[PDB]
Symmetry: D2
Subunit: 363 residues, 4 copies
């Protein structure tokens, strides 16, 4: 069996070079891969029409921000459409990103398909022609892919059928990417939907992650050239029990250190519909947790990085600067959280006769 | 788990009605699903050009033969292209077949894809959008699908990765078909390529078939509404050891009765590049084997049913009758073999002063 | 893998002969392998002390019946103790049984062991030194064994760990028995405890049996030289819904023909604490079921074959006759039932009268 | 599934404390669990009769060394016999060890059992009554156990049956140990027998370990309260290719960081019949390997810690000193090696001189 290696040293070399480059120095990933539909929901909240032009206009503002973002963002996931668009000067977005030293990625899955005989559980489509597409994307400047699997917690969920299917499909996609020079981002998301508590989520997350890594081993996937994008362990949305960032952090690292091999260079958490503040505090807490953490604990945020930026835009180029600033702040803040250096409300201890201030009363 | 049934009684009812109708009375299946390329190879052997018109012309002659064929053929597998073609009178082929009471099927897989880290082993593509396609095919008169998985016997082959992937993909396709009213023909073919002997093939066939049925159970597939299309157990093509129809029959039924549940209504063997004569003798022997046979043992032949017909054609409508006759003979003969009633060279015992003959000398 | 056969042609033959011999002609098995702890419960009810003598006495009465029982019983499963006991004249019980042409069997499992992290689920012990034990038993005239695995239906039961464990443990035992010349009776019992209905039981039983036979394949078990002793598909003991023999038969044969290979010679149903009457009726119905049945459908009854004999005995030696006649009575009607040739003169539903097992107090 | 915890917060704590205590500060384990049959081979070479006394005498010399060994050895694995023996003054060996602050362990497996249909592959026995055995051992002062599983590299080895069996048997043992308060040392050994090279060993070891940890997850084993004792990645004994400690270290740490979770406190390498020198050198190198190592990399040596002491003893009581000094000598340099603080003054390849284990005669 060892006489039929999946990759050559050169293929392994390029994969690890990319995987590490994306998470180097505490950098994270901007998940700007919202499809037309999803982007429509975003734009709808700010009373803007969902048209290719308005989508392009927003993405343009994010990608053309000060080159300083290459200190916080090491990669960006794009939706197919955007990979071929241009800014207002004819410059291709992908080339703008690359000039700054940012790695470009592409969403590779094609949504979910129903699994018969289960309680509303799915699997994911997208394997057909994935190789040709990856080779092509590779020519067009993409260096990494992203596949999202969905597991739900409910009555009879997740089932072993759901777990085994999604794990092996994820492993298939991973293998195919590596064969074409793309670093696969494995995203086994256990959705927050439900009234289940923290503890119930942590249990399920471990089970899914153990199945995921076993499948990857069976499929001969090169761990050093991959990235994991799992959910943080948290209670469900409809849960009454409220938890702190420290509790969530503990549950998370506990689940992760019992399943994810150290060969994996970086783990980037998905924001999963979290508020910008929570996504930062939790990640910070995750990097402060005393448990063994042999890999980078970063972020791969979508709305936790764009929520306020979209709000400052309003569909007016007239508000470009504010949009760029809102994005910049969130990127800097999360990069600090990925280093466990995010001090929340300012950085000053008790005082009031400290030295020469200005911070007092109000305004 | 039992509270989320995959199918309703009505869905189960229609599936079993179709599966049984195809193999009733000893009828078999004409596998006329050769793609453009494959059909090109066929036509090339008779010095005919591979064009949609010549393909159509041949298929036309087979489908318009005497209505008597509904006594031997219960189903026909078509390649997509042919499902929408017509005869020389504007009659759609699918409607011609149906008027005679023949069930129409369609090839659903899209070929194989390489499995990295194995010794040239593959998996099969085609799941993406399979549901929409099946629903559509259903509207267009198709009642059953066919998916072909390939397993090879060689150094490190078949591997457990290859076996588990192909079994579960086959189970996926099966589930999807049943959800759309199509009876899935599960074809786990262990190819004859190689110098391996009979015994080595029988071992591998059982292993693959056991994995197949386990996967189908995990995926909640309704066995009563399916059909199996496996290879007969035989030595490899490059094997020096020659075996008789009786030896092949024994190995086959032995492998089949130890793995395929009795809930399965019919097993139709693929011809696997066998000569027209062998495909008939072996199947006959398979039905004469004394072992337990709870299911129909029929055929789903391609070139074992067309070889001589293609030869009588030559690309001339002028030779239509001969083509129709060659096909008819092969269909009648194989239907007899599926009943264990195929007497080979005529039907007369020792004699020469039996009564009033004519069969003697030569000519 | 084909160059390392588990058994030789010779070993296979013997295993095939023993298995077929036991279930031939409608004959069943007497399950008299009650442990001293389990036997003490039976004797207690009839006011007899649980001593080695009383156990021997009763079992002597049963084993010394007229030679005719060899037309009803083809095998007897013994408990270790009884395999070395003698009748009132110094003659070994096993030798008496042998001279009547009955095949002797032995219980090989050593009870359950809890699986941590489950809801009161267990696995079975008895693998240690089992090979030596089997070799010795074979020298002492024993030709087959019995291993009982228990799976329960409840909250989170039966889990996949429970199913994989019991299935695989069951397969190890089977491989070991065969290596020593004994035919292993595989008994995966889904206990009737609980308030689940017929369909829940059917679902679980098909699931359990599919795992069992996949496990036996992985372990290279020769199915032709094995026997199966599964539960019948019935509602739980605490289920209020009433089911007739016809329904119980349909659900059962349906579960069996979807999972159990035709290679298995026979399926000897366990009585599971159901009335002597019900064990007979359900059995008769199962053989009258219009579904495909490539295997013999017989019985391997304990209480259902001994209840009356025990009650008629009462511990008094003078009741030898009434005890023997009662036993032979159950042995013959169950043999009839095994041929579907049983006719019960009497009509009822759930209401009235079967004052003789009105209804047990379960457990 | 989350409502049925295997262990309580209290039980977990203790398991965590014991495991960490053993490998803390660079300390390793003394593997003195040689069976009488295995011990008799050691004594034979030094011309000493294999009697219970001679075995006791030697083991007395080792256990009665200066209190300082508690800075090198954190645990000792005992063979049943030795767990109840006393020194020349009626004091229990285990009590001597305890007063030195050393944790006592016990060998729990009962040898291999052949798996039919494989190429001389085996599984391990010892599950029967193991729980009671563990409870008693715990009362007698034992805090951890040892279970050795053997996997070989050869024609068709190690098969998946062999891998699934040993992995799952290894997991049952582990769950049972933890339920009784003992920390299970999981030892999946890929034996060095054969002519395979470094890469073949690395491939198999990663495969075996992946199965092992997936199995431990299925069985709900608490990784934080376990320890791993795997083989080092080396070429087979009959391999001509020479490898340095650096290469052996690279291959080993590579296999480990891809499969072993950071939740596991320590990895104590088994010596596998390699020279005392090599066990030390390879160990030092492994800790100097620049790959991620979230676990302690220590030793659990048998021969490699006792070879010199034995040779210096010679069976003569007068050689107590030379025997103790020799032992402490190996115990300290191996503790240094466990910290990567070992320095060997001496240069060579394959040629010359190590006249003291020039090279063993294997097996
Ligand atoms: O049912 C059946 C069953 O399954 C069996 O076989 C029986 O058994 C039990 O006991 P207990 O008390 O615990 O519950 C046992 C086991 O362990 O073992 O058994 O095998 P066994 O001996 C039959 C019998 O029973 P009944 O109730 O029915 O009589 O068949
Ligand atoms: O190596 C190692 C191993 O792994 C082990 O531990 C050993 O051992 C064997 O023996 P034999 O003779 O059979 O081979 C055993 C088992 O069974 O058991 O052991 O655990 P044990 O006691 C170590 C040791 O060895 P050496 O050679 O190295 O010294 O560590
Ligand atoms: O949390 C996430 C990303 O950030 P959000 O914007 O959703 O907070 C992920 O769960 C997914 O990207 C997203 O919601 C699902 O959309 P998809 O990519 O499958 O079409
Ligand atoms: O034996 C067979 C059918 O009859 P033949 O014409 O090949 O003898 C089967 O093995 C397959 O149909 C065929 O050769 C492969 O072509 P495909 O369908 O995958 O594109």
């Amino acid at each position: 069996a060892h006489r039929f290696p999946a990759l050559t040293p050169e293929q392994k070399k390029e994969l690890s070079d990319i995987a590490q480059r994306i998470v180097a120095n505490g950098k994270g990933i901007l998940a700007a891969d919202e499809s037309v539909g999803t982007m429509g929901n975003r734009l709808q909240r700010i009373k803007v029409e969902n048209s290719e032009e308005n989508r392009r206009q927003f993405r343009e503002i994010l990608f053309t921000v000060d080159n300083s973002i290459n200190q916080s963002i090491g990669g960006v996931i794009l939706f197919h459409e955007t990979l071929y668009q241009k800014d207002s000067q004819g410059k291709l977005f992908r080339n703008i990103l690359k000039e700054k030293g940012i790695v470009v990625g592409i969403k590779l899955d094609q949504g979910g398909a129903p699994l018969a005989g289960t309680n509303k559980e799915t699997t994911i489509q997208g394997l057909d022609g994935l190789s040709e597409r990856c080779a092509q994307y590779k020519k067009d400047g993409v260096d990494f892919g992203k596949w999202r699997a969905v597991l739900r917690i409910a009555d009879q969920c997740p089932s072993s059928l759901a777990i085994q299917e999604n794990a092996n499909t994820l492993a298939r996609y991973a293998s195919i990417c590596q064969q074409n020079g793309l670093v696969p981002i494995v995203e086994p998301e256990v959705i927050p939907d439900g009234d289940h508590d923290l503890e119930h989520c942590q249990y399920v997350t471990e089970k899914v992650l153990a199945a995921v890594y076993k499948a990857l081993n069976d499929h001969h996937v090169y761990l050093e050239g991959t990235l994991l994008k799992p959910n943080m362990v948290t209670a469900g949305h409809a849960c009454t029990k409220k938890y702190t960032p420290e509790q969530v952090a503990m549950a998370t690292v506990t689940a992760l250190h019992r399943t994810v091999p150290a060969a994996v260079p970086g783990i980037c958490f998905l924001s999963g519909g979290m508020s910008e503040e929570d996504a930062t505090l939790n990640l910070n807490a995750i990097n402060l947790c005393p448990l063994p953490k042999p890999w980078k604990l970063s972020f791969s945020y979508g709305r936790a990085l764009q929520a306020s930026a979209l709000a400052a835009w309003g569909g007016k180029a007239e508000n470009k600067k504010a949009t760029q600033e809102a994005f910049m702040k969130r990127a800097v803040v999360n990069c600090q959280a990925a280093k466990g250096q995010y001090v929340h409300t300012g950085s000053s201890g008790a005082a009031s006769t400290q030295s020469l201030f200005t911070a007092s009363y109000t305004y």
